């Protein structure tokens, strides 16, 4: 518990220093901020283009030109304005379409791995998941979640069954694993071996169907439970 | 099958609209920034195709290998490993997926961008998996590999259905050999059926038909005299051959702006497949899947990835 | 000092030590945080 308390504090400290030294950390935020401001200056600076008319303006226009040659070029102005108006409205529709599915899916990892967990691989972090915290930001929202990674591996030799008494008995819930002499039980996740016994193992068939079978012994709880009854 | 990218274009407007014409160009530019933007959303369109094939194949920092003995109890295993013979360095399902999809013009500045990612590189990718999720199970998804003798993975795999171990141990012959003869009848059913990789060649034809399209629009009058500026220039004074001119500017630029809303429309449906190509992978590939009728129809055991002219196919 | 072009190189390679009765198990484990 005291380890894996400290190993949880160390990577929580961490991940303040990741945040603030490495820069360009939240471009997926930035990058949508950029584009609408990049789409609004682009709208607000075609107010000074003509479109073939003789000035931009409307006031000198309607000034120095009299009314029938003045709804010529009027009307070139309003044509213009409206295409420009209509395409920035297509792309505004096109980029909401594009931000609702991107925050679906937020919902979705809001619901299925904050208030629960998560057993799909790789929808949640990499690794095997345990827990993740949410945290605001201007615009969106932040994950941190946290997993669950082995290390420090080391190799043995197994068997698929173990033959005792024309019997083959397969693991429970584990393997069965060798340090070059002795046959042990251990869970597949991590290694903490037992000792063979009948209660992690059962019995199904004999020893001739299976190929890879091996010879051991396989301890029996009723053993010295006879001989301390006088 | 699904796909996850599409080809890339780049339009130039001076060339497409006024074909070094001065008199184009310096009429052209009183319309604003149209072309400024349809360019960025072009490049915008490209950037994102290059990402979309990142997603899905890159999901592995490291290359591994099969060893050069293979026995992997019973299991067969050749006909989606890469094959030494062939120069290529491709499985045999992977070139008749090649051979069964085949696609060139370059003019009025239309231009196709090379993908990053290679095809040798993509192949590489999906070998590596493969060597991967063969000799070390689901392990290599999470953390570092650790190798299992594959009858014990399968043992594995099938206590995930809610089958016990014995099953796999006394039936190993028999699940052997339906699994090879399954593999060897893949390849008929694929190769015999000519609408099999129908979802790849309809994204093919579409794109080639928009770029045609948009090519048969220069030939049209719109409303002037004549499709090609010089017989206008030469043909009428040019202090007033500004209506004809204005007339065809128009019409070309509307034109350019359809083709780029319907690129951009394509685009946003595309990413939604090459984001479910991706979940995929992770999901059915790495690990096993308890999900119904997401990797397959039954109860899911394992997948292998095989690449594509511009897609990818699973085997359930 | 300069600019280079190469090839790019798919990532780190490696071969697992497959046999048919060798099997690896972890003795430890770390807990790691991510953001997303
Ligand atoms: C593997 O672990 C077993 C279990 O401890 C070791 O067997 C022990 O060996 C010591 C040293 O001779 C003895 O004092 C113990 O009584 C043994 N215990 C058992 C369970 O018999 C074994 O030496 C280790 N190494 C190998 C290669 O098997
Ligand atoms: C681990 O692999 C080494 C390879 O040299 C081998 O010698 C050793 O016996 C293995 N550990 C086992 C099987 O306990
Ligand atoms: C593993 O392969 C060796 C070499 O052929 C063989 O002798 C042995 O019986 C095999 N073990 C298994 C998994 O049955
Ligand atoms: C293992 O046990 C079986 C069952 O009694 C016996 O026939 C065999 O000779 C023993 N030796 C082996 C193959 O390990
Ligand atoms: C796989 O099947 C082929 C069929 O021709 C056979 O030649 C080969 O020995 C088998 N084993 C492997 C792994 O290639
Ligand atoms: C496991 O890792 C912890 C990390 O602090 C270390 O203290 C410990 O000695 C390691 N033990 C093993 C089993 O490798």
Request: hydrophobic share 40%; with cysteine.
């Amino acid at each position: 518990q005291k380890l894996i308390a400290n190993q949880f504090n160390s990577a929580i400290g961490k991940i303040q220093d990741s945040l603030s030294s490495t820069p360009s950390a939240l471009g997926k935020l930035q990058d949508v901020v950029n584009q609408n401001a990049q789409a609004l200056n682009t709208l607000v600076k075609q107010l000074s283009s003509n479109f073939g008319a003789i000035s931009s303006v409307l006031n000198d226009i309607l000034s120095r030109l009299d009314p029938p040659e003045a709804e010529v070029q009027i009307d070139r102005l309003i044509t213009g304005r409206l295409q420009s108006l209509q395409t920035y409205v297509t792309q505004q529709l096109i980029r909401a379409a594009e931000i609702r599915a991107s925050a679906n899916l937020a919902a979705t990892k809001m619901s299925e791995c904050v208030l629960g967990q998560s057993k799909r691989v790789d929808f949640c972090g990499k690794g095997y998941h345990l827990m993740s915290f949410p945290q605001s930001a201007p615009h969106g929202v932040v994950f941190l979640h946290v997993t669950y990674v082995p290390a420090q591996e080391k190799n043995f030799t197994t068997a698929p069954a173990i033959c005792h008494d024309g019997k083959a008995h397969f693991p429970r819930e584990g393997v069965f694993v060798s340090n070059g002499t002795h046959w042990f039980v251990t869970q597949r996740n991590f290694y903490e071996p037992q000792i063979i016994t009948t209660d992690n193992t059962f019995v199904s068939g004999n020893c001739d169907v299976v190929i890879g079978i091996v010879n051991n012994t396989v301890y029996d709880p009723l053993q010295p439970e006879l001989d301390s009854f006088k | 099958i699904l796909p996850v990218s599409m080809t890339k274009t780049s339009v130039d407007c001076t060339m497409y609209i006024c074909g070094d014409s001065t008199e184009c160009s310096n009429l052209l530019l009183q319309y604003g920034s149209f072309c400024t933007q349809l360019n960025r959303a072009l490049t915008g369109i490209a950037v994102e195709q290059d990402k979309n094939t990142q997603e899905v194949f890159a999901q592995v920092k490291q290359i591994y290998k099969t060893p050069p003995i293979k026995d992997f109890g019973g299991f067969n295993f050749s006909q989606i490993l890469p094959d030494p013979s062939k120069p290529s360095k491709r499985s045999p399902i992977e070139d008749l997926l090649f051979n069964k999809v085949t696609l060139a013009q370059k003019f009025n500045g239309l231009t196709v961008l090379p993908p990053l990612l290679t095809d040798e590189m993509i192949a590489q990718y999906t070998s590596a998996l493969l060597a991967g999720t063969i000799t070390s199970g689901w392990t290599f998804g999470a953390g570092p590999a650790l190798q299992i003798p594959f009858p014990m993975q399968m043992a594995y795999r099938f206590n995930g259905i809610g089958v016990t171990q014995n099953v796999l141990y006394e039936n190993q012959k028999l699940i052997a050999n339906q699994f090879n003869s399954a593999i060897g009848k893949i390849q008929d059913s694929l190769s015999s059926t000519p609408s099999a990789l129908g979802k790849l060649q309809d994204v093919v034809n579409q794109n080639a038909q928009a770029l045609n399209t948009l090519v048969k629009q220069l030939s049209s009058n719109f409303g002037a005299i004549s499709s090609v500026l010089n017989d206008i220039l030469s043909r009428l004074d040019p202090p007033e051959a500004e209506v004809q001119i204005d007339r065809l500017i128009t019409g070309r630029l509307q034109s350019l702006q359809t083709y780029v809303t319907q690129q951009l429309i394509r685009a946003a449906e595309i990413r939604a497949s090459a984001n479910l190509a991706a979940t995929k992978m992770s999901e059915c590939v790495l690990g096993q899947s308890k999900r119904v009728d997401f990797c397959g129809k039954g109860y899911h055991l394992m997948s292998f990835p095989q690449s594509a002219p511009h897609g990818v196919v699973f085997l359930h | 000092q300069s600019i280079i072009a190469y090839t790019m190189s798919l990532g780190a390679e490696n071969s697992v030590a497959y046999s048919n009765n060798s099997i690896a198990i972890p003795t430890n484990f770390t807990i790691s945080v991510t953001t997303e």
